[PDB]
Amino acid sequence: AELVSDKALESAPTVGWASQNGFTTGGAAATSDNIYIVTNISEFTSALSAGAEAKIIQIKGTIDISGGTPYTDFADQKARSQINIPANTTVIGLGTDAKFINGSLIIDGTDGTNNVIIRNVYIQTPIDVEPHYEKGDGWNAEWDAMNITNGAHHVWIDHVTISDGNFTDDMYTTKDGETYVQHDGALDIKRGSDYVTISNSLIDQHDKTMLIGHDKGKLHVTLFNNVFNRVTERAPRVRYGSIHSFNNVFKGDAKDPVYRYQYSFGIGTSGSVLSEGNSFTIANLSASKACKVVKKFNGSIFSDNGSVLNGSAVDLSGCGFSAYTSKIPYIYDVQPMTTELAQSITDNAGSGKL
Template identity: 50%
Template sequence: MDLSDSVISDDYFFIFGFSALLSRELIDENFYIVDVETTSYAQVTDSVCQGRKIFAFISNDVDYYALQHLENVTLIDRRSPVKEVLSCLLVNNSRFNYHVKYKLSARENEVLTCMQQGLDTQQIGWASEAGGTAGGGEKPELSYYVTNIGELRQAIEESGDRPKRIWIGGLIDASGGVPYLNRQDQSRRGRIFIGSNTTLMGIDENARFVESALIIQDVSNVIIHNIYIENPVDVDPQFEEGDGWNAEWDGLSIIRAQHVWVSNVTFSDGRFTMDMYKTVDGWKYVQHDGSLDIKRASDYVTVSHCVFTLHDKTILIGHSDNNDEEDAGKLRVTFHDNLFTRVVQRTPRVRFGNVHLFNNVFDNDVADPIYKYQYSFGIGKDSRTLSELNVFNVKGQTVACRLFKGFGGEYLSDSGSVFNDTTADLNACGFNTTSVVRPPYDYFPQWDLTPEFVDAVRRSAGNMLDYRVMV
């Protein structure tokens, strides 16, 4: 028997990427990690393990046949790269929990060390290509802990483009508690520009940005991790004839930037939902723009384990049909293991980009009292979208092809996705499926879209990690 089959064929382990923390207070005895090179087969029995899940590092087919009879066992080829081993480990309640039952070798201790670091720099997706995305790196030159907007701006200014990790330890209000007067004032005080070679990390679920527009512009090598972004409210929307009031600011903008990884971030309208818009001159006074914009030749971007909720125009990739000279061949973006819930549209809306989406969960409702669902993928000019193994739960929608909306684009291919608990032929929606190619990077999708997997994606997404034990 081919050993690789035993490594990846187990039905019950979930593949989430590597942004989960082993938090000390959560270590328990749910799991055993066993190294068969330091442990005899006789020591690993169902009675000893008492029904707990077992992760056994094995080296050959003899090990496989000796242990395959056990209940709840995952067999992992100990010769695999660390990142592949990590991708095989089960996530329970969004964190890696383990109990070291037997002595482990140096290799297994290396795996556990990577788990405890909480953030693996060898991420999946387009951000891993062309040299990868390390942010401030594993051992940054500079490290900051900030709790307010003044400290954050000082850290950004002092560090410049030197490798750094900036820990966010509380509420960051770019306004400083002083309301913006007009668009010029909001532009001057409300924007936060992130420099190159930066890892911006929330220390726990209280790391939040409000009244802030985060901008990654004309830089490279940035990681944004484990924060909550409340989409900024434009205090001075502009009126466009025939289109009404339009807002300016996005929660996070990626502009002419390369190598960006956004993980475990929650985007939400938060305290100011769209039912709170007033009417001015007969038009709805819209005060939100996007949650996430990726535009103007930005490239090599991965968005993983994020939550997008309570928003209308959610994600824009490529800002104009007339920007082909700058955008063509760029805007390569991966979305995986994200949760989109109670959002209206643009998840994402794409122009020119080469976008890959897998193992994302979409929970929406066409009759939502505030955020009435319209569509998920907007297929725009010269874009190519590859959808794999996504889960679409849309209450009140019976036509699968209404998940997609064409905006002059023609290339969309799907495989293995589920619509309202049934397999749907999403390639029968009138788009060209043959000109969408697979990306060049390795990735490990979950093939069995069980309710347990879907619930686990919901639990693991967003700013829910606790790093206080590490600072």
């Protein structure tokens, strides 16, 4: 159809892992017949059926993954809400109101999927209609907002917003004396996926958000100019993989009524994190308790240079970790974190901000 988005055919910035050992161009090589404008899930799956052929799919308005039909149970939700994005695909939202609800976008490398760009779209985390009761311990929600799985490499998430939105956790009901959790993870990157860049995005209002690894020598993820607002934990929590996080904004409250801030970085098995010029504005978090932003699990590699906590340069080098030593293969400009920069990144973060 018609190319209406000015930014649709641009590829990932040369900065980031998604541009290492190959560039991430999505469907920029698409022919005129592989340019779409989709308004619903049927039109969306039809355009995606173009397979591994370069495709540009422009999202107009709200895409209700459920197709206006509520999921009857787990089986129904499992069969209808998971939309696979194939190789060489660019999903770019039009305007400021392009969004997805009631489902998950899946980049599955089982068919060899790689070279995917998801941009300028709001993904409201799906609600699991039938959570499973865990071993005497609360309810377990099953669905993601976005999952990168099975060797899927070269993925660029830019100006995307992921949020609980219309249904935040303060609205959870309790069943059998336990909170009926219907939200899962926000973004999961696992199973040997690799070469990913997440930029100018916003994760707003969510609990367990970003889990990387779930491997040795894979999972390279770069994150810059993103905002993590009222996010309980994992921004991200990594294992078997190195992440490069610089010039991001984390805003929370260690005593928030709904998404009480726990930590941002989770250092797991063979996981490494290079943090630089990040802004941490966490209410109820004492300057002497700054190492709370980094939580160790089974990993040991963690380094931070130039990050701030509540407006003051913080020293997160004595938190109990070994230095990040591997080199970053690409050049990048880490800007000094100031009140001005943190505010500007907050203005720019998320969908509708292209």
